Amino acid sequence: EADCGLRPLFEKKSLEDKTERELLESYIDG
Amino acid sequence: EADCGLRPLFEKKSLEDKTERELLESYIDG
Amino acid sequence: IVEGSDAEIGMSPWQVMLFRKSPQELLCGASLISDRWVLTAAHCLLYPPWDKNFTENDLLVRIGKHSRTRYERNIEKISMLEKIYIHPRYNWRENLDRDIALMKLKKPVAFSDYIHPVCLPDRETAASLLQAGYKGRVTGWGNLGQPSVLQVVNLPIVERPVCKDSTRIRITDNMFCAGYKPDEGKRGDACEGDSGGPFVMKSPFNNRWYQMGIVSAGEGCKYGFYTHVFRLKKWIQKVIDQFGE
Amino acid sequence: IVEGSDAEIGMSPWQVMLFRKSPQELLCGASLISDRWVLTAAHCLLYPPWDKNFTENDLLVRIGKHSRTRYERNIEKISMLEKIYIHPRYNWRENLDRDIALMKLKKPVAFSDYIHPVCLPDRETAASLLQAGYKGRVTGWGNLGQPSVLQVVNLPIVERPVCKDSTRIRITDNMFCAGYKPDEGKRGDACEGDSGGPFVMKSPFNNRWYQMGIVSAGEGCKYGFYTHVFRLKKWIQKVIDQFGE
Ligand SMILES: *[C@@H]1O[C@H](CO)[C@@H](O)[C@H](O)[C@H]1NC(C)=O
Ligand SMILES: *[C@@H]1O[C@H](CO)[C@@H](O)[C@H](O)[C@H]1NC(C)=O
Ligand SMILES: [Zn+2]
Ligand SMILES: [Zn+2]
């Protein structure tokens, strides 16, 4: 609704899962 | 939230309370 | 509500009877906006002078009621509060600047023909219906003199220059005022006990009822002030979006 | 989920195991967006060819689970559905045009470190992250071969011209597709049973997870299609705003 898409064990915990980096490797403009 | 401010016994029932007209008497621009 | 009259059933279903735990006593008013979000006046909850340090445990509310005394069974709804939230820059000291509060509920609440929330006003809606010569409806249980059922009076919104001269307190812009001029002979004003309750207007546009204010200080038993809900909307949405889970 | 890997705990807490009533059998996938709103694929519910006329009574869902077999006690959450809503112009006949559905829940649902919803995408978010050369994450329980826990594979979004040539079905614009080219040697695609489940992307901007699609037809066990959630957002908001009480 408004606090959505922030997993309480990760992005509220300031952590990152095994493979979420992998995703971010494949973006960024130029 | 989104269905708000529509009393189920009136504006959904197509009815009007005793004195809601009274209010509408006191608006309308010009 | 003085020189009022009886509401018929489900005429303000966003009404909420803010009713302290021990002993068994009606407090202010309040209003339902979401299915977990009651809107009320802070000096109900917070006000050093009359010992008022009301915490979340200490009060329940009663939603979807006509009679003050009795109990409607399976009609009305008994609700606890999971959290209160007074406005941060709330000035009890001087002129009840930002007299406004929010109370999250324990459980959520199912809707009915007798319980239902009110719409909060948007841009058009608030600089269109707030006006010189326009009325809204303040609904409330306080004195007459006591009303066996929920009252409902309609009062007219007093011009900026006029509230000012008539009263002793410095009115901010985060309030407006309403009540009849002695001029006519329509007496009518929120009595004390009707604090925290909804000033409402029926939009001519979408046929929707909107809270524009909250009985800040009715007096009645001069012009009744109200906190200018719209001019503190930005606050509400910060609180709702952030907590409310 | 083929050539997948094990999710750690609370890595997709908006995951929902759409699990038919009698007998006891995993169905598709689904996704949690509000605290009463599960998002899934229609051919889970509606699809004449495999006898599929699934009504609101006939299915429950399971929210905030890792293992497929077992039961986590006081961790997960057993939920019924108060109403289904297939998309009005939904084309089972040809190319699963608008393969999308919504399922209101009986009661509401409290959130936890293991249950939580996902964000639906706005303007910027959907014409920024949908792209050539970008990946999202399809999470799912279907075959290997069976996974004792929830799987999670990350797949890359196949260029408009390429899905088209590779497949036999006419793709509408209310879908996109993803899966690895045979070129590399990364195999990986949604298997069948993972239908209805969330394609997700982590916004680099707000660090927010967004559903862009829904496993329309994974196949796996070629490129997996997905319904283009964003291009059918307007629909979702019509259904949520109007019912959902
Ligand atoms: C109310 O009481 C609490 C603790 O009992 C205290 O922290 C707080 O300072 C008091 N608030 C006011 C406004 O007096
Ligand atoms: C599913 O069954 C119901 C009644 O059992 C019927 O009204 C409806 O036409 C069927 N729907 C489809 C899509 O076949
Ligand atoms: Zn949360
Ligand atoms: Zn309603």
Coordinates of C-alpha atoms and ligand atoms in Angstrom, one line a residue:
Chain A
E1 CA 0.0 0.0 0.0
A2 CA 2.7 2.5 1.2
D3 CA 5.3 0.5 3.1
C4 CA 5.3 -2.0 0.3
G5 CA 8.1 -4.0 -1.3
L6 CA 10.5 -3.6 1.6
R7 CA 11.2 -7.0 3.1
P8 CA 11.4 -6.7 6.9
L9 CA 14.3 -9.1 7.1
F10 CA 16.3 -7.2 4.4
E11 CA 15.7 -3.6 3.3
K12 CA 14.5 -2.7 6.8
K13 CA 17.4 -4.8 8.3
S14 CA 19.8 -3.0 5.8
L15 CA 20.7 -6.5 4.4
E16 CA 20.8 -7.9 0.8
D17 CA 19.9 -11.4 -0.4
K18 CA 22.4 -13.7 -2.3
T19 CA 21.4 -12.7 -5.8
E20 CA 19.7 -9.2 -5.7
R21 CA 23.1 -7.6 -6.6
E22 CA 23.0 -9.8 -9.8
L23 CA 19.8 -7.9 -10.9
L24 CA 21.4 -4.4 -10.4
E25 CA 24.4 -5.6 -12.5
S26 CA 22.1 -5.6 -15.5
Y27 CA 20.6 -2.1 -15.4
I28 CA 22.3 1.4 -15.3
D29 CA 21.9 3.7 -18.5
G30 CA 25.0 5.3 -19.9
Chain B
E1 CA -10.7 5.3 1.3
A2 CA -12.5 5.2 -2.1
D3 CA -16.1 4.3 -1.5
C4 CA -16.1 6.9 1.3
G5 CA -18.7 9.5 2.3
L6 CA -21.6 7.7 0.8
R7 CA -24.0 6.6 3.5
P8 CA -25.4 3.2 2.6
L9 CA -28.9 4.1 3.8
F10 CA -29.0 7.3 1.7
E11 CA -26.8 8.1 -1.3
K12 CA -26.5 4.3 -2.2
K13 CA -30.3 4.1 -1.4
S14 CA -30.9 7.3 -3.6
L15 CA -32.5 9.0 -0.5
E16 CA -31.8 12.3 1.3
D17 CA -31.9 13.2 5.0
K18 CA -34.3 15.8 6.5
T19 CA -31.8 18.7 6.4
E20 CA -29.1 17.9 3.8
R21 CA -31.1 20.1 1.3
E22 CA -30.7 23.0 3.7
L23 CA -26.9 22.8 3.2
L24 CA -27.2 22.9 -0.6
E25 CA -29.4 26.0 -0.4
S26 CA -26.4 27.9 0.9
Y27 CA -23.8 27.3 -1.9
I28 CA -24.0 27.8 -5.7
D29 CA -21.7 30.5 -7.3
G30 CA -23.2 33.1 -9.6
Chain C
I1 CA -25.4 20.0 20.5
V2 CA -27.7 23.0 21.4
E3 CA -30.9 23.8 19.5
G4 CA -30.2 20.6 17.6
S5 CA -32.5 17.9 16.3
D6 CA -32.6 14.1 16.0
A7 CA -30.6 12.4 13.3
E8 CA -32.3 9.6 11.5
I9 CA -30.5 6.2 11.3
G10 CA -27.1 6.1 9.3
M11 CA -27.0 9.9 8.6
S12 CA -23.5 10.2 9.9
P13 CA -22.2 6.5 10.0
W14 CA -18.5 7.9 10.3
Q15 CA -19.5 9.1 13.8
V16 CA -17.5 7.6 16.8
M17 CA -18.3 7.9 20.5
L18 CA -14.9 8.3 22.2
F19 CA -15.7 6.5 25.5
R20 CA -13.1 6.3 28.4
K21 CA -12.4 2.9 30.1
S22 CA -12.7 3.3 33.9
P23 CA -15.1 4.7 34.9
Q24 CA -17.8 4.4 32.0
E25 CA -18.0 7.9 30.5
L26 CA -18.5 9.6 27.0
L27 CA -15.6 11.7 26.1
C28 CA -15.5 13.7 22.9
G29 CA -16.4 12.8 19.4
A30 CA -14.2 11.5 16.7
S31 CA -14.7 10.5 13.0
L32 CA -14.0 7.4 10.9
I33 CA -11.9 8.0 7.7
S34 CA -10.4 4.6 7.0
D35 CA -11.2 1.2 8.4
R36 CA -8.6 1.6 11.1
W37 CA -8.3 5.4 11.4
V38 CA -10.3 7.6 13.7
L39 CA -9.9 11.4 13.5
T40 CA -10.3 13.5 16.6
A41 CA -9.3 16.6 18.6
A42 CA -6.1 16.6 20.6
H43 CA -7.5 18.3 23.7
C44 CA -9.6 15.2 24.1
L45 CA -6.3 13.3 24.6
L46 CA -3.7 15.9 25.5
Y47 CA -4.2 19.0 27.6
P48 CA -2.1 19.5 30.9
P49 CA -4.7 21.9 32.7
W50 CA -7.5 19.2 33.2
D51 CA -5.1 16.2 34.1
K52 CA -5.4 15.0 30.5
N53 CA -2.7 12.5 29.7
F54 CA -4.7 9.8 27.9
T55 CA -2.8 6.8 26.7
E56 CA -3.8 4.0 24.2
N57 CA -4.8 1.5 26.7
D58 CA -7.1 3.8 28.6
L59 CA -9.9 4.4 26.1
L60 CA -12.0 2.4 23.8
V61 CA -14.4 3.9 21.1
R62 CA -17.9 3.0 20.0
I63 CA -18.7 3.0 16.2
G64 CA -22.1 3.1 14.4
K65 CA -24.5 4.3 17.3
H66 CA -27.6 6.4 17.5
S67 CA -28.5 6.4 21.3
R68 CA -26.1 7.8 23.8
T69 CA -27.3 5.6 26.9
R70 CA -28.2 2.2 25.5
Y71 CA -26.5 -0.6 23.6
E72 CA -27.5 -1.6 20.1
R73 CA -26.6 -5.3 19.8
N74 CA -24.9 -6.6 16.5
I75 CA -25.7 -3.1 15.1
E76 CA -22.8 -1.1 16.7
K77 CA -19.2 -2.0 17.2
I78 CA -16.8 -2.0 20.3
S79 CA -13.2 -1.1 19.3
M80 CA -9.9 -0.6 21.2
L81 CA -7.0 1.6 20.0
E82 CA -3.7 0.2 19.0
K83 CA -2.1 3.7 19.0
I84 CA -2.8 7.4 19.4
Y85 CA -0.9 10.1 17.5
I86 CA -1.2 13.7 18.6
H87 CA 0.1 16.3 16.1
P88 CA 3.9 17.1 16.6
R89 CA 3.6 21.0 16.6
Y90 CA 0.4 21.0 18.6
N91 CA 0.0 24.1 20.8
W92 CA -2.1 23.5 23.9
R93 CA -0.4 26.6 25.5
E94 CA -2.0 29.5 23.5
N95 CA -4.8 29.1 20.9
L96 CA -5.1 25.3 20.2
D97 CA -3.0 25.7 17.1
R98 CA -3.2 22.4 15.2
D99 CA -5.9 20.8 17.5
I100 CA -5.9 17.5 15.7
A101 CA -5.1 13.8 16.5
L102 CA -5.2 10.3 15.1
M103 CA -6.0 7.0 16.8
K104 CA -5.2 3.7 15.2
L105 CA -7.5 0.9 16.1
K106 CA -6.6 -2.5 17.6
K107 CA -8.3 -4.8 15.0
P108 CA -9.7 -3.5 11.7
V109 CA -13.4 -2.8 11.4
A110 CA -16.0 -4.2 9.0
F111 CA -18.5 -1.8 7.3
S112 CA -22.2 -1.6 7.4
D113 CA -25.3 0.5 6.7
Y114 CA -24.6 2.0 10.1
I115 CA -20.8 2.1 10.1
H116 CA -19.0 3.7 7.1
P117 CA -16.1 6.3 6.8
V118 CA -16.1 9.9 5.5
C119 CA -14.0 11.4 2.7
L120 CA -11.2 13.8 3.4
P121 CA -11.1 16.8 1.2
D122 CA -8.9 17.4 -1.9
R123 CA -7.9 20.7 -3.5
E124 CA -11.1 21.7 -5.4
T125 CA -13.3 20.3 -2.6
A126 CA -11.6 22.5 0.1
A127 CA -11.3 25.9 -1.6
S128 CA -14.9 25.4 -3.1
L129 CA -17.1 24.5 -0.1
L130 CA -15.3 26.3 2.7
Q131 CA -16.7 29.7 2.2
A132 CA -18.5 32.8 3.3
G133 CA -22.3 31.9 3.4
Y134 CA -21.9 28.1 3.3
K135 CA -22.8 25.6 6.0
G136 CA -21.8 22.2 7.1
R137 CA -23.1 19.8 9.7
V138 CA -21.7 19.2 13.2
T139 CA -23.0 16.0 14.7
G140 CA -22.8 15.3 18.4
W141 CA -24.0 13.9 21.8
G142 CA -23.1 16.6 24.4
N143 CA -25.7 18.6 26.5
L144 CA -29.2 20.2 25.8
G145 CA -30.6 18.6 29.2
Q146 CA -29.4 15.3 27.8
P147 CA -30.3 13.7 24.2
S148 CA -31.4 10.1 24.2
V149 CA -30.1 10.0 20.6
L150 CA -27.3 11.4 18.3
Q151 CA -27.8 15.0 17.4
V152 CA -27.2 16.9 14.2
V153 CA -27.1 20.7 13.7
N154 CA -26.1 22.6 10.6
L155 CA -24.1 25.8 11.1
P156 CA -22.7 28.6 8.7
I157 CA -19.0 29.4 8.2
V158 CA -18.0 32.8 9.7
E159 CA -16.0 35.2 7.5
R160 CA -12.3 35.4 8.4
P161 CA -12.5 39.2 9.5
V162 CA -15.6 38.4 11.7
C163 CA -14.3 35.4 13.9
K164 CA -11.2 37.5 14.5
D165 CA -13.0 40.6 15.9
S166 CA -15.6 38.6 17.9
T167 CA -13.1 36.4 19.8
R168 CA -10.2 37.1 22.2
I169 CA -7.9 34.3 21.1
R170 CA -5.5 34.7 18.1
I171 CA -7.0 32.4 15.4
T172 CA -4.4 30.8 13.2
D173 CA -5.1 29.8 9.6
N174 CA -5.0 26.0 10.7
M175 CA -8.6 26.7 12.0
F176 CA -11.8 28.3 10.8
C177 CA -15.0 29.1 12.8
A178 CA -18.8 28.7 12.6
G179 CA -22.0 29.5 14.5
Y180 CA -24.8 31.9 13.8
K181 CA -24.6 35.6 14.2
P182 CA -26.9 36.9 17.0
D183 CA -28.4 38.9 14.0
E184 CA -31.0 36.3 12.7
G185 CA -32.4 34.4 15.7
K186 CA -31.1 31.0 14.7
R187 CA -29.2 30.0 17.8
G188 CA -27.1 26.9 17.4
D189 CA -23.6 25.8 18.3
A190 CA -21.5 22.8 19.3
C191 CA -21.7 22.4 23.1
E192 CA -18.7 21.2 25.1
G193 CA -18.4 17.4 24.9
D194 CA -19.0 17.5 21.2
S195 CA -15.2 18.3 20.8
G196 CA -13.3 16.2 18.2
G197 CA -16.3 15.5 16.1
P198 CA -16.7 16.0 12.4
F199 CA -17.7 19.2 10.7
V200 CA -19.1 17.8 7.4
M201 CA -20.2 19.2 4.0
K202 CA -22.0 17.3 1.1
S203 CA -20.1 18.1 -2.1
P204 CA -22.5 19.3 -4.7
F205 CA -20.1 17.8 -7.3
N206 CA -19.7 14.1 -6.4
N207 CA -22.5 13.9 -3.7
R208 CA -19.7 13.0 -1.2
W209 CA -19.5 14.0 2.4
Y210 CA -16.3 15.6 3.5
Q211 CA -14.7 16.4 6.8
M212 CA -13.4 20.0 6.6
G213 CA -13.0 20.5 10.3
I214 CA -13.1 19.0 13.8
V215 CA -14.9 20.6 16.8
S216 CA -11.9 22.3 18.4
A217 CA -13.8 24.4 20.9
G218 CA -17.6 24.6 20.5
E219 CA -18.4 26.4 23.7
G220 CA -22.2 26.9 22.9
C221 CA -23.3 26.3 26.6
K222 CA -19.4 33.9 20.3
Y223 CA -18.6 31.4 17.5
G224 CA -17.4 27.7 17.7
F225 CA -13.9 27.1 16.3
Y226 CA -12.8 24.1 14.3
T227 CA -9.3 22.9 13.2
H228 CA -9.0 23.5 9.4
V229 CA -8.6 19.8 8.5
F230 CA -7.6 20.4 4.9
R231 CA -4.7 22.8 6.0
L232 CA -3.4 19.9 8.0
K233 CA -4.1 17.1 5.5
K234 CA -0.4 16.8 4.6
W235 CA 0.1 15.7 8.2
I236 CA -2.6 13.0 8.2
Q237 CA -1.1 11.3 5.1
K238 CA 2.4 11.2 6.7
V239 CA 0.9 9.3 9.7
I240 CA -1.4 6.9 7.8
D241 CA 1.1 5.9 5.1
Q242 CA 4.0 5.4 7.7
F243 CA 2.2 3.5 10.5
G244 CA -1.2 1.9 10.0
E245 CA -0.1 -1.8 9.6
Chain D
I1 CA 11.4 -23.4 -11.2
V2 CA 14.2 -25.1 -13.2
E3 CA 17.9 -24.5 -12.6
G4 CA 16.8 -22.4 -9.7
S5 CA 18.2 -22.1 -6.2
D6 CA 17.0 -21.9 -2.6
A7 CA 15.6 -18.6 -1.3
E8 CA 16.6 -17.6 2.2
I9 CA 13.9 -16.7 4.6
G10 CA 11.6 -13.5 3.8
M11 CA 13.2 -12.9 0.3
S12 CA 9.8 -12.8 -1.3
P13 CA 7.3 -12.3 1.6
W14 CA 4.6 -11.3 -1.0
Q15 CA 4.6 -14.9 -2.2
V16 CA 1.4 -16.9 -1.9
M17 CA 0.8 -20.6 -2.4
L18 CA -2.6 -21.0 -4.2
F19 CA -3.6 -24.3 -2.7
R20 CA -7.0 -26.0 -3.8
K21 CA -9.5 -27.3 -1.2
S22 CA -10.4 -30.9 -1.9
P23 CA -8.1 -32.8 -2.5
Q24 CA -4.9 -31.1 -0.9
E25 CA -2.9 -29.8 -3.9
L26 CA -0.6 -26.8 -4.8
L27 CA -2.0 -24.8 -7.6
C28 CA -0.2 -21.9 -9.1
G29 CA 1.4 -18.9 -7.5
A30 CA 0.0 -15.6 -6.6
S31 CA 1.3 -12.4 -5.1
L32 CA 0.3 -10.1 -2.1
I33 CA -0.2 -6.4 -3.0
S34 CA -2.5 -5.1 -0.3
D35 CA -3.6 -6.8 3.0
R36 CA -6.6 -8.3 1.3
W37 CA -5.5 -8.4 -2.3
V38 CA -3.8 -11.4 -4.0
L39 CA -2.7 -11.0 -7.6
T40 CA -2.6 -14.1 -9.9
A41 CA -3.0 -15.5 -13.4
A42 CA -6.4 -16.2 -14.7
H43 CA -5.7 -19.6 -16.3
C44 CA -5.2 -20.8 -12.7
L45 CA -8.9 -20.0 -12.2
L46 CA -10.5 -19.9 -15.6
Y47 CA -9.6 -22.1 -18.6
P48 CA -12.3 -24.3 -20.2
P49 CA -9.9 -26.9 -21.7
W50 CA -8.7 -28.5 -18.3
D51 CA -12.1 -28.4 -16.6
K52 CA -11.1 -25.1 -14.8
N53 CA -14.1 -23.4 -13.3
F54 CA -12.7 -22.4 -9.9
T55 CA -15.0 -20.6 -7.6
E56 CA -14.4 -18.6 -4.4
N57 CA -15.4 -21.3 -2.0
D58 CA -13.2 -24.0 -3.6
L59 CA -9.7 -22.7 -2.9
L60 CA -7.7 -21.3 0.0
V61 CA -4.2 -19.7 -0.1
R62 CA -1.1 -20.0 2.0
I63 CA 0.9 -16.8 2.8
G64 CA 4.4 -16.4 4.2
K65 CA 5.9 -19.9 3.5
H66 CA 9.3 -21.4 2.6
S67 CA 8.8 -25.2 2.4
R68 CA 6.3 -26.7 0.0
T69 CA 5.5 -29.9 2.0
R70 CA 5.4 -28.9 5.6
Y71 CA 3.6 -26.5 7.9
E72 CA 5.3 -23.6 9.7
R73 CA 3.2 -23.0 12.8
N74 CA 2.5 -19.4 13.9
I75 CA 4.9 -18.3 11.1
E76 CA 2.6 -18.8 8.0
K77 CA -1.0 -17.9 7.5
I78 CA -4.1 -19.8 6.3
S79 CA -6.5 -17.6 4.3
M80 CA -9.8 -18.1 2.5
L81 CA -11.1 -16.0 -0.4
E82 CA -14.1 -13.8 -0.2
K83 CA -14.1 -13.2 -3.9
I84 CA -12.3 -13.8 -7.2
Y85 CA -12.3 -11.4 -10.1
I86 CA -11.1 -12.5 -13.5
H87 CA -10.3 -9.7 -16.1
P88 CA -13.4 -8.8 -18.2
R89 CA -11.8 -8.9 -21.6
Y90 CA -9.7 -12.0 -20.8
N91 CA -8.9 -14.1 -23.8
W92 CA -8.4 -17.8 -22.9
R93 CA -9.3 -18.6 -26.6
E94 CA -6.2 -17.4 -28.5
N95 CA -3.0 -16.1 -26.8
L96 CA -4.0 -15.6 -23.1
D97 CA -4.5 -11.8 -23.8
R98 CA -4.9 -10.2 -20.4
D99 CA -3.9 -13.3 -18.3
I100 CA -4.6 -11.6 -14.9
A101 CA -6.9 -12.0 -12.0
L102 CA -7.6 -10.7 -8.4
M103 CA -8.8 -12.6 -5.3
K104 CA -10.2 -10.8 -2.4
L105 CA -9.5 -12.5 0.9
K106 CA -12.1 -13.5 3.6
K107 CA -10.6 -11.7 6.6
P108 CA -7.8 -9.2 6.4
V109 CA -4.2 -10.3 7.0
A110 CA -1.6 -9.0 9.6
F111 CA 1.9 -8.4 8.4
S112 CA 5.2 -9.9 9.6
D113 CA 8.9 -10.4 8.8
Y114 CA 7.7 -13.4 6.7
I115 CA 4.4 -11.9 5.2
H116 CA 4.5 -8.5 3.5
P117 CA 3.1 -7.1 0.1
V118 CA 4.9 -5.9 -3.0
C119 CA 4.7 -2.5 -4.7
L120 CA 2.8 -2.2 -8.0
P121 CA 4.7 -0.1 -10.5
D122 CA 4.1 3.6 -11.5
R123 CA 5.0 5.4 -14.7
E124 CA 8.9 5.9 -14.2
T125 CA 9.2 2.5 -12.5
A126 CA 7.6 0.6 -15.5
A127 CA 9.2 2.3 -18.6
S128 CA 12.6 2.4 -16.6
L129 CA 13.2 -1.2 -15.4
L130 CA 11.3 -3.1 -18.1
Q131 CA 14.0 -3.2 -20.7
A132 CA 16.3 -4.9 -23.1
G133 CA 19.2 -6.4 -21.0
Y134 CA 17.5 -6.2 -17.6
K135 CA 16.4 -9.0 -15.3
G136 CA 13.8 -9.6 -12.7
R137 CA 13.2 -12.5 -10.3
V138 CA 10.5 -15.2 -10.7
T139 CA 10.0 -17.1 -7.5
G140 CA 8.1 -20.4 -7.4
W141 CA 7.5 -24.0 -6.2
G142 CA 6.8 -26.1 -9.4
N143 CA 9.1 -29.0 -10.5
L144 CA 12.9 -29.7 -10.7
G145 CA 12.4 -33.4 -9.3
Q146 CA 10.6 -31.6 -6.4
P147 CA 12.0 -28.6 -4.2
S148 CA 11.6 -29.0 -0.4
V149 CA 11.7 -25.2 -0.3
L150 CA 10.6 -22.0 -2.2
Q151 CA 12.8 -21.4 -5.3
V152 CA 14.1 -18.2 -6.8
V153 CA 15.6 -17.7 -10.3
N154 CA 16.5 -14.5 -12.0
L155 CA 15.8 -14.2 -15.7
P156 CA 16.5 -11.5 -18.4
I157 CA 13.7 -9.6 -20.4
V158 CA 13.7 -10.6 -24.1
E159 CA 13.6 -7.9 -26.7
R160 CA 10.2 -7.3 -28.4
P161 CA 11.4 -8.5 -31.9
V162 CA 13.0 -11.6 -30.4
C163 CA 10.0 -13.1 -28.4
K164 CA 7.9 -12.6 -31.5
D165 CA 10.1 -14.5 -34.0
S166 CA 10.9 -17.3 -31.4
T167 CA 7.2 -18.2 -30.6
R168 CA 4.2 -19.4 -32.5
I169 CA 1.6 -17.4 -30.6
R170 CA 0.7 -13.8 -31.4
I171 CA 2.0 -11.8 -28.4
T172 CA -0.1 -8.8 -27.5
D173 CA 1.5 -5.7 -25.8
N174 CA -0.4 -6.7 -22.6
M175 CA 2.5 -9.2 -22.1
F176 CA 6.3 -9.3 -22.2
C177 CA 8.6 -12.4 -22.2
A178 CA 11.8 -13.6 -20.5
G179 CA 14.2 -16.6 -20.4
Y180 CA 17.7 -17.1 -21.4
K181 CA 18.8 -17.3 -25.0
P182 CA 20.3 -20.8 -25.8
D183 CA 23.4 -18.5 -26.7
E184 CA 25.0 -18.3 -23.3
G185 CA 24.5 -21.6 -21.4
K186 CA 22.5 -20.2 -18.5
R187 CA 19.4 -22.3 -18.7
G188 CA 16.6 -21.2 -16.5
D189 CA 12.8 -20.7 -16.9
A190 CA 9.5 -20.8 -15.0
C191 CA 8.3 -24.4 -15.0
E192 CA 4.5 -25.1 -15.3
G193 CA 2.9 -24.8 -11.7
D194 CA 4.8 -21.6 -11.2
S195 CA 2.0 -19.8 -13.2
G196 CA 0.4 -16.7 -11.5
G197 CA 3.5 -15.9 -9.6
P198 CA 5.3 -12.6 -9.4
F199 CA 8.0 -11.4 -11.8
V200 CA 9.8 -8.8 -9.6
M201 CA 12.4 -6.1 -9.9
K202 CA 14.3 -4.1 -7.3
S203 CA 14.1 -0.4 -8.1
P204 CA 17.5 1.1 -8.1
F205 CA 15.8 4.4 -7.2
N206 CA 13.8 3.8 -4.0
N207 CA 15.2 0.2 -3.3
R208 CA 11.6 -1.1 -3.7
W209 CA 10.4 -4.4 -5.2
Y210 CA 7.9 -4.1 -8.0
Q211 CA 5.7 -6.6 -9.7
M212 CA 6.0 -6.0 -13.5
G213 CA 4.5 -9.3 -14.5
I214 CA 2.9 -12.6 -13.6
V215 CA 3.9 -16.0 -14.8
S216 CA 1.4 -16.3 -17.7
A217 CA 3.0 -19.4 -19.3
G218 CA 6.4 -20.4 -18.1
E219 CA 6.7 -23.8 -20.0
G220 CA 10.4 -24.5 -19.0
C221 CA 9.9 -28.2 -18.6
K222 CA 11.5 -21.0 -26.1
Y223 CA 10.9 -18.1 -23.7
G224 CA 8.5 -17.8 -20.7
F225 CA 5.7 -15.2 -21.2
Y226 CA 4.3 -12.9 -18.5
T227 CA 1.3 -10.6 -18.4
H228 CA 2.5 -7.0 -18.6
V229 CA 1.1 -6.0 -15.2
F230 CA 1.7 -2.2 -15.7
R231 CA -0.2 -2.2 -19.0
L232 CA -3.2 -3.6 -17.0
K233 CA -2.7 -1.4 -13.8
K234 CA -5.7 0.8 -14.7
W235 CA -7.8 -2.4 -14.4
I236 CA -6.5 -3.4 -11.0
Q237 CA -7.3 0.0 -9.5
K238 CA -10.9 -0.1 -10.8
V239 CA -11.4 -3.4 -9.0
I240 CA -9.7 -2.5 -5.7
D241 CA -11.2 0.9 -5.3
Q242 CA -14.8 -0.4 -6.1
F243 CA -15.0 -3.7 -4.1
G244 CA -12.4 -4.5 -1.3
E245 CA -14.6 -3.7 1.7
Ligands
LIG1 C1 2.3 12.1 30.1 O1 2.8 11.1 31.0 C2 4.0 10.4 30.5 C3 4.3 9.2 31.4 O2 3.3 8.9 32.3 C4 5.2 11.4 30.3 O3 6.3 10.8 29.6 C5 4.8 12.6 29.5 O4 5.9 13.6 29.7 C6 3.4 13.2 29.9 N1 2.9 14.1 28.9 C7 2.5 15.3 29.1 C8 2.2 16.0 27.8 O5 2.4 15.9 30.2
LIG2 C1 -18.7 -21.9 -14.8 O1 -19.8 -22.5 -14.1 C2 -20.9 -21.6 -13.8 C3 -21.9 -22.3 -13.0 O2 -21.5 -23.6 -12.4 C4 -21.5 -21.0 -15.1 O3 -22.4 -19.9 -14.9 C5 -20.4 -20.4 -16.1 O4 -21.0 -20.2 -17.3 C6 -19.1 -21.3 -16.1 N1 -18.0 -20.5 -16.7 C7 -17.3 -20.8 -17.7 C8 -16.3 -19.8 -18.1 O5 -17.4 -21.9 -18.3
ZN3 ZN 5.8 -3.4 7.0
ZN4 ZN -19.4 0.9 1.4

